[PDB]
Amino acid sequence: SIPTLNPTVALVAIDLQNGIVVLPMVPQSGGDVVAKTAELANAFRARKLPVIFVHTSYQPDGAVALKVKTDVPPSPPNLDPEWSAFAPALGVQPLDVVVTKHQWGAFTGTDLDVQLRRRGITDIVLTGIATNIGVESTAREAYENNYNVVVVSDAVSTWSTDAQTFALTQIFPKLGQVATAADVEAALET
Amino acid sequence: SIPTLNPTVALVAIDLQNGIVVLPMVPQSGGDVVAKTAELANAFRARKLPVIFVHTSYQPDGAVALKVKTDVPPSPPNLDPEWSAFAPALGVQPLDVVVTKHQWGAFTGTDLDVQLRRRGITDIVLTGIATNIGVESTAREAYENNYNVVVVSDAVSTWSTDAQTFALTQIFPKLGQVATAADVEAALET
Numbered sequence: 001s002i003p004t005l006n007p008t009v010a011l012v013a014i015d016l017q018n019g020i021v022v023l024p025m026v027p028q029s030g031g032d033v034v035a036k037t038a039e040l041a042n043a044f045r046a047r048k049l050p051v052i053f054v055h056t057s058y059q060p061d062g063a064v065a066l067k068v069k070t071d072v073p074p075s076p077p078n079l080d081p082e083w084s085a086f087a088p089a090l091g092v093q094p095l096d097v098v099v100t101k102h103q104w105g106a107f108t109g110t111d112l113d114v115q116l117r118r119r120g121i122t123d124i125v126l127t128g129i130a131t132n133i134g135v136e137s138t139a140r141e142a143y144e145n146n147y148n149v150v151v152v153s154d155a156v157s158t159w160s161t162d163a164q165t166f167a168l169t170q171i172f173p174k175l176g177q178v179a180t181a182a183d184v185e186a187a188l189e190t
Numbered sequence: 191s192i193p194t195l196n197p198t199v200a201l202v203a204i205d206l207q208n209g210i211v212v213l214p215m216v217p218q219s220g221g222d223v224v225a226k227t228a229e230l231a232n233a234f235r236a237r238k239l240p241v242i243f244v245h246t247s248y249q250p251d252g253a254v255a256l257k258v259k260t261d262v263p264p265s266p267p268n269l270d271p272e273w274s275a276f277a278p279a280l281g282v283q284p285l286d287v288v289v290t291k292h293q294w295g296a297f298t299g300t301d302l303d304v305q306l307r308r309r310g311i312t313d314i315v316l317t318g319i320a321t322n323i324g325v326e327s328t329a330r331e332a333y334e335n336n337y338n339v340v341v342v343s344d345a346v347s348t349w350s351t352d353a354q355t356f357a358l359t360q361i362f363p364k365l366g367q368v369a370t371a372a373d374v375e376a377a378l379e380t
Contacts, residue, residue: 004259069194069338071363104365108334132361137334140327144298148259166356171322173261175294 003150003179005187010050010121013037014106014128014135016090017055019083025129025157027164034087036155036181037127041091043185050119052097054106054128054138057084064102105137112138113145123148125184127155131167139175149176152184193340193369195377200240200311203227204296204318204325206280207245209273215319215347217354224277226345226371227317231281233375240309242287244296244318244328247274254292295327302328303335313338315374317345321357329365339366342374 016037021030028036041051058065058077065077078084084100086092099112106112116124124147128135135156142149151172158164172178179187206227211220218226231241248255248267255267268274274290276282289302296302306314314337318325325346332339341362348354362368369377 066333066336068333068336068365069367070365071367074364103334104330105334108331133364137330140294140330141298143256143258144293144295144327146256146258163356163360166353170353174264174323175258175260177259177261 002183002187003177005150006123006148008120009123009125010052010116010119011040011044012052012054012106012112012124012126012138013041013090014054014126014138015056016053016087016128017083018085018087019078019080020129021087023129025159026161028154028157030129030157031089033127033129033155033157034089036152038089038091040125040127040152040155040181040184043188047188050097050115050121052099052112052115053086053090053092054099054101054112055084055086056102056134057100058102059084066103104134105141106134107138107141107145116147123150125150125152127152129157131156131158132163136167136171139172143175150184151176151178152181153178154180192373192377193367195340196313196338198310199313199315200242200306200309201230201234202242202244202296202302202314202316202328203231203280204244204316204328205246206243206277206318207273208275208277209268209270210319211277213319215349216351218344218347220319220347221279223317223319223345223347224279226342228279228281230315230317230342230345230371230374233378237378240287240305240311242289242302242305243276243280243282244289244291244302245274245276246292246324247290248292249274256293294324295331296324297328297331297335306337313340315340315342317342319347321346321348322353326357326361329362333365340374341366341368342371343368344370
């Protein structure tokens with residue numbers, strides 16, 4: 001069923017960067033998530049609707065990476081500039097909004113909310129990697145910040161099909177709407 | 191294994207209020223979550239460490255409840271003052287910190303971060319209901335805000351054992367530490 005969308009809608013794409021799109025993920029590959037996101041981005045730009053590309057960086061020195069105590073030790077911060085560069089197939093344009101984050105979710109320490117508010121945006125369409133981590137944290141926070149959230153099922157991927165299903169069926173329906181890229185495109189054309 | 195805790199630690203208990211503790215939940219009841227939390231609270235107060243009790247309210251008129259579009263329609267806001275009153279068995283004291291929230295997580299629209307910062311707190315021990323909703327959203331945000339987060343496995347409950355297990359094994363170990371109430375108490379006594 002096609003999601004309900006206000007005209008004041010933005011596309012927000014999480015962590016479609018070289019170091020993350022090459023990771024193993026399901027139910028579609030990093031490449032497919034990138035491709036789907038680009039297709040949606042074209043539909044948004046066609047309507048003069050903002051496209052917001054989010055990437056994670058710990059430049060210049062890694063000191064901004066969280067070092068809080070966790071049971072699962074995190075990877076050390078990757079300081080290769082290519083790690084945080086956008087996937088070339090994503091088609092990031094010079095007038096697109098680029099948001100740089102330093103943790104899972106895309107609000108903390110960023111200008112995402114500033115960009116949304118100042119552009120009059122009420123609704124966000126969310127894509128990216130990983131469904132349960134950067135996507136979900138952004139989704140949860142966006143909901144608390146009174147945005148209508150739509151998550152694109154065939155443009156979010158994660159580490160297992162169980163995790164995908166859990167987020168899409170147990171969490172996201174409670175904080176927003178779950179739809180396919182095609183469903184979202186149809187809701188725009190309305 | 192006992193969690194690692196700095197001395198600058200607070201107990202933060204989510205939504206142990208009449209309207210939520212009576213809900214069906216696993217792997218322990220609302221009553222058990224309340225009891226366990228009170229026991230920990232005693233251990234914290236004994237050490238002059240802050241105890242922060244969080245509840246959800248939509249008083250006076252329900253207008254502050256989120257009305258964003260979701261696939262699963264939410265319950266209308268319950269405006270019975272008893273719905274948001276703390277469970278009597280929780281033993282909330284007049285010098286305890288009471289935080290009032292209007293959505294899942296305990297930071298948005300609250301003084302939680304202000305209370306933590308001003309009290310010099312670096313570490314939070316988290317209890318309450320539901321594991322995947324108010325507890326997890328608070329945990330996720332606390333992590334992004336550079337707090338060491340510990341979630342108390344036998345003092346958080348949710349709607350299914352699959353959901354409990356997913357949060358405790360797939361999410362929380364990546365943003366903090368998972369331990370039992372007894373483990374936490376032992377880490378204090380160190």
